[PDB]
Amino acid sequence: SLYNVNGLKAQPWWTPKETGYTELVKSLERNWKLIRDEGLAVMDKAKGLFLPEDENLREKGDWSQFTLWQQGRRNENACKGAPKTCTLLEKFPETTGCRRGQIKYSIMHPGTHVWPHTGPTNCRLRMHLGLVIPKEGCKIRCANETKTWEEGKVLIFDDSFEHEVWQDASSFRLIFIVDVWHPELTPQQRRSLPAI
Ligand code: NI
């Protein structure tokens, strides 16, 4: 990709400790219900704050997002929708300042499959916080390892690896997606790398 930095540690799945972003992960997991509740509050389509997720192609099913940060820019109207979550995230420039990432609620509905794909850059890691996870039917593969989400828990993967998602439940799957700068990027790089 045009948006890669050579030599950045490359592995499909990361532990929180490996990323060094332990305070961010702890805060996400401490406050998971608070974050979930704000997502649920605006989740009404009648409200209509969740919009289609066109980030990548899906074979079938429905997929929606409510984006709080985009390329390091706070969505003001969105944060009025999720004020406590936004206030919380502001403590963590490693994600709010990630100009190559996003911060968003992501809902995936029953009968959805997202084709194998890669993100645009090896310069971010993608955190998933489980908010509402169906008992069965949802999973995500990254490279050769397939995993499931857990409510209140963070998964972290390098989405520049090929990954793929299935929603084979009967009820919706809500997660919170938090992108961070790859931890081996210098402060100079975090300041100067053009957004994507
Ligand atoms: Ni993806």
Author numbering: 563 to 758
Article, verbatim:
Here, we report crystallographic and biochemical results on the structure and substrate selectivity of AspH. The results reveal a key role for the TPR domain of AspH in substrate binding and, unexpectedly, that the preferred EGFD-substrates of AspH have a non-canonical (Cys3–4) disulfide pattern. Whilst the oxygenase domain fold of AspH is typical for the 2OG oxygenase superfamily, details of its active site and the role of the TPR domain in EGFD-substrate binding are remarkable. Whatever the precise extent of conformational changes during catalysis, the results reveal a central role for the TPR domain in enabling AspH catalysis—without it, 2OG turnover occurs, but EGFDs are not hydroxylated.
However, no hydroxylation of hFX EGF139mer was detected by mass spectrometry (MS). Using a [1-14C]-2OG based assay, we observed AspH-Ox catalysed turnover of 2OG to CO2 in the absence of substrate, demonstrating oxygenase activity, albeit uncoupled from substrate hydroxylation as precedented with some other 2OG oxygenases under certain conditions. A structure of the AspH oxygenase domain (AspH-Ox) was determined with Ni(II), substituting for Fe(II), and with L-malate (from the crystallisation buffer) bound in the predicted 2OG binding pocket. As expected, the AspH-Ox structure is comprised of 8 β-strands forming a double-stranded beta-helix (DSBH) fold, with its active site located at the more open end of the β-sandwich. In contrast to most 2OG oxygenases, the active site metal is only coordinated by two histidine residues (His679, His725), located on DSBH strands II and VII. Two water molecules and a malate molecule complete octahedral coordination of the metal ion. Overall, the Asp-Ox structure validates the expected DSBH fold with intact Fe(II) and 2OG-binding sites, consistent with the observed 2OG turnover. In the AspH-Ox structure, the side chain of Glu617 appears to mimic the Asp103hFX side chain interactions with Lys666 and Arg688, possibly reflecting a function for this residue in protecting the active site from oxidation in the absence of substrate.
